[PDB]
Design a protein around this ligand. Structure first.
Ligand code: F88
Length: 298
């Protein structure tokens, strides 16, 4: 359902700026909205819209994303809906909260050198280094966001560090770029039949049986944990993503531990990658386990 009296924002109160990243049939644009959340207050926002080449099919898909966002509602660890421009005479525009540091994969990679496992007093205190505490904290926040999405009877289907945005005060948010990411140019997406799929993040029942469940999102979460504790490296380094790769994964071949992990975080990755989906932990279990590691790390 679309509740207009609430979500409809006037096009003349939105000031479009520079494009953020590159898309195929969609585009994300930085903008400044007047009084979208607080009365008569300017606010920087991100706007998702279509571009030249898009058809009626992509327009239906963008409207579906807006309806899903209305249904889900807000949570701290999900990129939240602020409003929309749906009225005739202009393009469909979906307005969300702005996350100033961008996606997590790019962020962690750019800051790989500015990392220390623990801050040793007094010099490290005033230096803005990334630590094990930060990494376990981002991991725990994504598990909380995913537990919330499961509670609303939703499944992600493209969970990865490139679909995590970093906001102020170390808050991370789950998102979905959709066709606002150029998946035809992006090496993370592999051609399989008539489609471009994220093979390195997909569970065996997803690759071989086309089965998508909350437990195959748990498998992708295990991959996301590897990307965080490798500080933005690409999964399965040196491995050719072909028929042999899929065969080995189906027989129990798994990734070796990343460079910045602790033994218990690598053991969490292995559990997420259990061959049997029912034997993988739930998102509620992951929240419990990560919370305890964050208390042990302190
Ligand atoms: C899982 C729940 N769910 C959410 C949806 C819709 C959705 O996530 N839409 C979406 C996704 C990404 C967007 O992009 C950005 N948003 C905020 N800030 C950004 C900041 C950026 O750079 C500093 C930037 O650079 C590339 C991109 C930014 C905008 C809208 C569907 N399901």
């Amino acid at each position: 359902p679309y509740d207009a009296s609430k979500w409809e924002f006037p096009r003349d109160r939105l000031k479009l700026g520079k494009p953020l990243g590159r898309g195929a049939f969609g585009q994300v644009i930085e903008a400044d909205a007047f009084g979208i959340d607080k009365t008569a207050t300017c606010r920087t926002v991100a706007v998702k819209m279509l571009k030249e080449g898009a058809t009626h099919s992509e327009h239906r898909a963008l409207m579906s994303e807006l309806k899903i966002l209305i249904h889900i509602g807000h949570h701290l660890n999900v990129v939240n809906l602020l409003g929309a421009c749906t009225k005739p005479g202009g393009p469909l525009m979906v307005i969300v909260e702005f996350c100033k540091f961008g996606n997590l994969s790019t962020y962690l990679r750019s800051k790989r050198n500015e990392f220390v496992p623990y801050k040793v007093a007094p010099e490290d205190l005033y230096k803005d280094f990334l630590t094990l505490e930060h990494l376990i904290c981002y991991s725990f926040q994504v598990a909380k966001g995913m537990e919330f999405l499961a509670s609303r009877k939703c499944i992600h289907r493209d969970l990865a560090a490139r679909n995590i945005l970093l906001s102020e005060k170390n808050v991370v948010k789950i998102c979905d770029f959709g066709l606002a990411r150029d998946i035809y140019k992006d090496p993370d997406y592999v051609r399989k039949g008539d489609a471009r799929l994220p093979l390195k993040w997909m569970a065996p029942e997803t690759i071989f049986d086309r089965v998508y469940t909350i437990q195959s999102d748990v498998w992708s979460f295990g991959v996301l944990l590897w990307e965080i504790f490798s500080l933005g490296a690409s999964p399965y380094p040196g491995v050719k993503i072909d028929e042999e790769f899929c065969r080995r994964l189906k027989e129990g071949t798994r990734m070796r531990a990343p460079d910045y992990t602790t033994p218990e975080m690598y053991q969490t990755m292995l559990d997420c990658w259990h061959g049997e989906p029912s034997q993988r932990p739930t998102f509620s279990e992951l929240v419990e386990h990560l919370g305890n590691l964050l208390q042990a790390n302190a």
